[PDB]
Amino acid sequence: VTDRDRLRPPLDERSLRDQLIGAGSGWRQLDVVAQTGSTNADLLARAASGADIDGVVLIAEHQTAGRGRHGRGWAATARAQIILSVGVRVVDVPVQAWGWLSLAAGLAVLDSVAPLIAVPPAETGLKWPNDVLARGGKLAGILAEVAQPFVVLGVGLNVTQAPEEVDPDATSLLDLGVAAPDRNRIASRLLRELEARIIQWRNANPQLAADYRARSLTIGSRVRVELPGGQDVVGIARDIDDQGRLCLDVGGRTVVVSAGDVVHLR
Ligand SMILES: [N-]=[N+]=N[C@@H]1[C@H](O)[C@@H](CNS(=O)(=O)NC(=O)CCCC[C@@H]2SC[C@@H]3NC(=O)N[C@@H]32)O[C@H]1n1cnc2c(N)ncnc21
Hints:
BirA Bifunctional Protein, domain 2; seven-stranded mixed sheet; 30% strand; ligase/ligase inhibitor; biotin-protein ligase
């Protein structure tokens, strides 16, 4: 709505750089662009042209051709979200562990906005694999894409984004009760949390898996998992394995899923 536009001041690039670039911080480069097609596509293009995108941060005020998992889109309007992509060098890490990098990102996003909520409503946590939920609504979506030797981590976090603007099952910090969300503070918290989780992932820290399970909305729930190819599997989510894959209990049989869409059942 037009009223929410007043609640959407521009990001401060200079200030974010002062806070996030320098001693004690792994981020080497940060840019805020007014608009782009897809921040993920941009960092992928940079890498494909020889640039070292490790520790590089790209933030867009607006994204006109956003991308979701397996061919889907991501909708946004100007200054209503935190829209960023991050480059991570991964070649030094075994390929089996790359799946955990995306789980780590969602954990970082959740922890960056969790205390801003007045009281924990039902369904505030992480849905496997790339979903930050709050009150059942999708608060943020994570997209990891490969460009050797890097992985580009993308985050779309609904700050003041109205569900009617993007998606019916969406929610935002504003629609959760946060009156005047400051994207500068939130982005700063987010990238600081993200830095910690990436280091943890890179060093195979046990705390990463433990912290994920503690915030998982999926583990322990009856779920319908829509597999790639259109097949549905119904069971009970039990655990995450060492590759970040979802372990399903289907009537006593174990089904391990590497990718798919999860729906929490009654
Ligand atoms: N159901 N469905 N429909 C929409 C779409 O089909 C679906 C896609 N979700 S998804 O397949 O699990 N993928 C994701 O959640 C990952 C999205 C990553 C976006 C980030 S933003 C910066 C970076 N650059 C990119 O191009 N992508 C990444 O989410 C719905 N959707 C679109 N915009 C949304 C909304 N702003 N908030 C919540 N949900 C919404």
